[PDB]
Amino acid sequence: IWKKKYIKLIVVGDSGLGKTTLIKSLISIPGERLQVHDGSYTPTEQFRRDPESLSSTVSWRDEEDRVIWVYKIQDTPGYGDELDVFRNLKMVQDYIESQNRKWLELEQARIEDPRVDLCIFCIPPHRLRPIDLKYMFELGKHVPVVPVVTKADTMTIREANTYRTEVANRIANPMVPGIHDKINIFKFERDTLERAGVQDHATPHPPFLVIASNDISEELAAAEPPLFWPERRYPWGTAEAFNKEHSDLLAVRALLMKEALEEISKTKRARYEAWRRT
Ligand SMILES: Nc1nc2c(ncn2[C@@H]2O[C@H](COP(=O)(O)OP(=O)(O)OP(O)(O)=S)[C@@H](O)[C@H]2O)c(=O)[nH]1
Ligand SMILES: [Mg+2]
Numbered sequence: 006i007w008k009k010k011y012i013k014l015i016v017v018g019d020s021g022l023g024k025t026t027l028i029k030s031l032i033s034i035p036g037e038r039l040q041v042h043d044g045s046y047t048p049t050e051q052f053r054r055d056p057e058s059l060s061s062t063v064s065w066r067d068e069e070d071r072v073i074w075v076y077k078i079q080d081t082p083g084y085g086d087e088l089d090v091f092r093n094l095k096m097v098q099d100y101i102e103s104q105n106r107k108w109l110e111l112e113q114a115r116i117e118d119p120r121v122d123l124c125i126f127c128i129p130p131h132r133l134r135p136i137d138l139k140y141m142f143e144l145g146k147h148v149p150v151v152p153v154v155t156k157a158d159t160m161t162i163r164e165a166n167t168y169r170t171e172v173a174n175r176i177a178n179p180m181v182p183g184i185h186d187k188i189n190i191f192k193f194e195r196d197t198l199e200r201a202g203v204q205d206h207a208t209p210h211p212p213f214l215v216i217a218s219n220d221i222s223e224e225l226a227a228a229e230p231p232l233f234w235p236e237r238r239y240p241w242g243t244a245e246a247f248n249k250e251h252s253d254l255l256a257v258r259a260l261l262m263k264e265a266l267e268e269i270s271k272t273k274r275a276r277y278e279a280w281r282r283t
Contacts, residue, residue, distance in 0.1 A: 006071065010270055011118035013077040013104070014261070017097055017144065018127030019137070020046070020083025023155040026217045027127065028078050030235065030246065031258050032063045039233060042219050049082045049093070056100065063262075074266065079121070090136055094143055101147045105280050120277060122269050123191060123261075124148045128212060130159040133172050138179040138188070145189030148276070151261075152176060152190065152212035157252060158237055158244040160214075170208045193265055201260035202249070216244055216252035 016024050029042045040061065052059055059080040066073055079100070084093035104119040126141050141150055152172065160168060176188055190210060199205075218235040225232040235246035246254050 007066075007073050008071060009073045009075060009116075010266075011075045011077070011120075012123075012266065012269055013079060013119065013121050014123050014125055015079040015081060015097065015101070015121050015148070016125045016127065017081050017140070018083060018155070019129055020085035022083065022127045022129055023217055024083065024127050025080055026219055027125075027153070027155060027215060027254075028061055028080055029219070030217045030254060031262065032061045032076070032078055034063065034065075034258065034262055037063055037065070044219060046086070047080055047082045049086050049096075052080075052082050052096070075117075076262065084140060090140070094140055097144065098147055105277065108277070109281075120273070121148050122273060122276075124150045125261075126150045126152050128152055128154045128172060130154055130156050131164065131168060133175050135179075135181045138175060138181050138184065141176070142179070142181075142184050142186075142188045147280075149189050149191035149272075153257065154212050154214045155217070157214040158216045165214055169206065169211045169214060173208045173211045176210075176212075193260065194268060197264045197268060198260070201264040202256045203253075203260065204256075213253040213257050215254045215257055216246045217254055218244075218246050 016028055018024050025042045025047055026044075029040045033039045033041075047059060056079070061078045061080070063076045064074060081097055081100075082093065084090045087093065101121045104121055107119045124144055126137075126144070128137060141152070144150060154168065154172060157165060176190060179188065192210070216237065218237045220236060220238065222232075222234040222236050225234040237244040237246070244251050246252050249255060
């Protein structure tokens with residue numbers, strides 16, 4: 006009767022960029038559980054000895070299509086947590102490979118799908134470094150990448166417009182030694198981007214610029230009924246994560262959690278098929 010479909014995202018980036026805060030905002034679709042982060046750092050050892058404790062899950066039903074979506078977002082430690090950046094890269098690459106070997110062993114015997122479909126690559130504000138592009142390239146060889154600039158409240162409007170173009174340009178032309186193929190960026194359809202409320206910039210395929218917060222408005226949480234409004238309250242003013250003029254966060258969630266569900270699931274068999282030559 007019901008058909009179950011599975012999406013698994015993995016989130017990667019440098020340490021302290023707000024990866025875990027962003028994850029908790031993404032899976033906290035209104036109507037669901039409202040999950041929040043406490044600001045502590047994601048330890049490398051925890052990902053090694055208990056990666057499931059770093060996985061967030063949400064599920065919902067599509068009545069008309071008779072589909073049960075099971076959505077997982079895998080958190081990872083920042084690749085600045087240790088001395089060697091490429092140890093983190095290998096750890097994440099091995100995680101993706103391990104999920105494929107799980108699916109193969111289950112398919113051999115025979116269906117809870119553990120495979121990774123998409124990577125959210127969190128980019129620091131103001132400056133994109135060669136190691137970020139190197140990480141993005143090598144990771145893209147295993148899974149398509151969605152670039153997201155976090156902590157967008159770090160940049161003025163003018164800085165943000167300049168950086169959005171620079172990030173898009175560097176991804177198309179990294180100019181990093183050893184990168185000789187294109188970075189595997191996931192291409193969303195325009196109809197999908199428009200339905201999600203993505204603004205149509207002059208720069209093609211820009212990154213998303215998000216603000217996320219584990220703090221909520223005290224005034225709005227005291228409403229009847231309470232309204233949950235993530236905010237970042239500074240002495241000079243308050244940035245709002247759900248404000249379309251401050252943050253792409255709501256557009257990112259609509260894109261990844263709703264509008265792009267089909268085209269992410271479609272490319273699943275092709276990706277795994279290419280992987281099988283191993
Ligand atoms: N200025 C600003 N700070 C943010 C934003 N999102 C999260 N932060 C802050 O960044 C700090 C770390 O956030 P966190 O989500 O834990 O980063 P992280 O990437 O997961 O850290 P890691 O150790 O696991 S690698 C917290 O103080 C949080 O409040 C944001 O959008 N703007
Ligand atoms: Mg974290």
